[model samples]
Target chain A: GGHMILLKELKELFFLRTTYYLKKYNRSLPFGDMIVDRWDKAKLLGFGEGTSIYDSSIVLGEVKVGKDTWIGPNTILDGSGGGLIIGSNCSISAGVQIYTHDTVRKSLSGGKADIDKASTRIGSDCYLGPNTIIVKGVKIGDRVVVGANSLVLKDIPSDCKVFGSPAVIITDSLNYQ
Target chain B: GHMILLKELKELFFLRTTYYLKKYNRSLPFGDMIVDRWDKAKLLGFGEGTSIYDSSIVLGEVKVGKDTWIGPNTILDGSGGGLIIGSNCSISAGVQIYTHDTVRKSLSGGKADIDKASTRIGSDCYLGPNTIIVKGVKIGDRVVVGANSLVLKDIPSDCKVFGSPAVIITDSLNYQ
Candidate 1:
């Protein structure tokens, strides 16, 4: 094979694809993002069909994502401690972090307490806004909308619009803080 | 440049890193497989002994001081208002400090102005992973902010805070 010719072709293809995404999204994807197929990565991971994960996203240990899940760019899925199980049709927005472990106790105790671990689960059809962080062992039910930059410190039931840090339910009732 | 084997080329390219983390009692992602972290930080004009991963993004007039460790995938947005951060700080991975909110404009059919405010972080502060500091939050010196915290207000010096709308868990920086 002509190595130089292959390199030239790869450059042209990457440029063409990057330009396409740039025009569509008003932002340019990195070289790796332009070259790699997000759905293909999901398929290789044995995730359900139509689920796409960006090449830039990081996953550790056992992570199970259901069908039609869109894992956006630069996300962190840490299932190393226990496991992360996210259901289908979930929109895991950019920079979101869902962890199954934390080292808070250990740090506070000066390494006396061990790192805590538990399975963090998110139900189907959820929309997580950009930069939302779900701490270890959270169980979020289906159809929940977490506003951007929220911190999920506790379990959230289904069909609720949770917002703010230590995310709380936002009700339509009078004088909700 | 002389022609070299692919493995040899990879080895050479891998060594172009700042092992400065070693001096700060930290280690790189590996012993040294990652290169050009200092190069990226240098391009941003970060201070001495500072390093930022290539995956991070900085927009609009943001300034960082010496010995700061900026982890990967962090976003420092200063587009609408300039941001100032002091020395010896830890801006952890997944931290997004934004300075402009488009909500007002979007909600008002582009008739309302975008909300803008400057943000600041003082020296010797440690911001944990996935922490979010919204527009205009001023964090004081020697503070320890734990993971997944949402800091939406001003914090005085020498304190430790954790949680959404973070409350002062400790008044002093002993933080242990």
Candidate 2:
């Protein structure tokens, strides 16, 4: 009777935890979005309310985001550059990297040159596409539409759309693709 | 008394999983270890000192030389013909090396067979995190592929390459 009780208990508890997360958030978050409370994590990082960061996202040093910013899975917010400030309602898509520091010069200079660090900022209502990379010290204005897979190397002014390897403005106007 | 046992069971296993998960500082706790890394490599017929993470996806016939380190969430697809990775290679997290493509097949309404070929990587190569090696590409020895680069072309030996469709660095090549 005791053995049967123990067996049933273990089975029930195991699946219950797994399914509870599955229904709410989950263990099967597919490299993450669930299993961790995004909003809770965000607030813990001192981010504004309504912002939720994925469990798969990597955050390091002095990063700040405004309210309602949806930081998707596998995104890197590296404030090690100096500080990374992101504004409200920004969609930091999956695999997007906002890096504020670089080791290029140090690698090139045989450890003689120092790693460069700089602050990076992104304004409100920005849609940073999937897998896009934003380099150190770039200041992006509000409502910017950055296309997927772009590597941003320079500062982007407000109300523009940019794309490509070394990201450049394809449209400064709001109407174009 | 019946309800008390059920509650205790729930706390022991269900909430226990959640409690550890909240910390995110534990692994395989309350769960059995799935695979031994060395044994897995041996079973896959990989060379000595080669290790792949348990989360890595292996498909078709992928052969890796000795002392290669493949990190978590990697995909090695050798189904096209085969995939060869040489010794002392660092295949970082989320890196995907493929030897097949369905572009032609899909474009031809699935009439054409998927384009496939052997992909090769020479020794002492470092493929950065999330780097992608598309079908039929050859990389020479001592290659350094930067993170997030989509490798669409062959990389010559002793070169440091980065960018989308990575271009070899003119001055940064030949590290050794």
Candidate 3:
């Protein structure tokens, strides 16, 4: 009882609310080791259950991930714009960078132009290939398979396969069955 | 008796070192998990006498030949591109390769320009750092690419290519 009282006092001293902790450290606490599971990692990022985020993945701002989605290592989910959303069963591969905002136009226009801020969404059952970059406000439909290293600049329709610098739909039919 | 004193001091030092090792949960030197071993879990398939540095990821079906050196943070993705590398190749850091393209399919509204093909790289090639290879492109043997080049097309044998859209800068092809 005495040790528990000391732990509670320490928590109060640090102002250890969830928001305050994240704001102070700029990241979640180091919970994942050889012992922590994905459920622990997901709770740390405010993600849903059954979603496994690799220890090296980064999630910032208001990002919502559905159940059973695998966020690989070195993946960045930048929710700085409005928010970023990922549906269930999505494979966000390694080195994939998804943005909800870009300041390219504003930076080029001497800060006169406004930065583009839009929510980026990836539907369920989507396979984003490795090293791909998704720009701001691009909505990827369900079951869409984007090939590796493709730069996605536009919205992708459902059940299609796309790959390239500016990704294009190569096939309209995608058979996962 | 003086020699016995030196031996006892040596044992004490060794015991102290092992005690700190156990306390920190870190392995001793030369017993590290990532210390120059090819039997790790990150690589799909690596050839004999090959060393891939840490932080590199080799996806499925990627086969590397003998005596090759892959630098750190290199991604050999065979998920769509079907990567196959030959012997004596040096792939530098931060190189990314893919095997498919769909730009024509969407750009032309599905009428023309459908690019979906596997990439093949020949043996004895040197890829520079941060070079990007598009899908379905066949790069012949003994080719050298400069740093930060983008290969959008097929390259013939014994050519040195560099630049953004990687052009054939030199075809002499004599190397050290």
Clashes of each: 0, 2, 2
RMSD after CA superposition, every candidate: 8.8, 11.5, 14.0
lDDT of candidate 1 over A1-177, digit per residue (tens): 344444455456645654575455433344466557899999998899989998779998999999878887788998988899988777787788899899999999999998899889998767786788899889997767777777899998876778886788984211110
What's the ranking of the predictions by TM-score, best on top? 3, 1, 2
- Candidate 1, CAPRI quality class derived from DockQ: incorrect
TM-score (chain B) for candidate 3 is: 0.69
Off by over 4 Å in 3: A1-40, A109-115, B1-51, B58-67, B76-87, B96-122, B128-176
> For model 3 chain B, where is the 10-residue window of minimal lDDT?
B28-37
| TM-score for each candidate, following the candidate numbering | 0.54, 0.50, 0.56
Chain A TM-score for predicted structure 2: 0.83
Return the TM-score for candidate 2, rounded to 2 decimals.
0.50
lDDT (CA) for every model shown? 0.74, 0.74, 0.68
CAPRI tier of model 2:
incorrect
Scored by TM-score, the top model is 3
Encode model 2's per-residue lDDT on A70-123: one tens digit a residue.
786668999987899998777786668999999999999999999899899998
Output the number of the DockQ-best candidate: 1
lDDT of 3 by residue, A2-33 (tens): 43343344334333332343354232222121
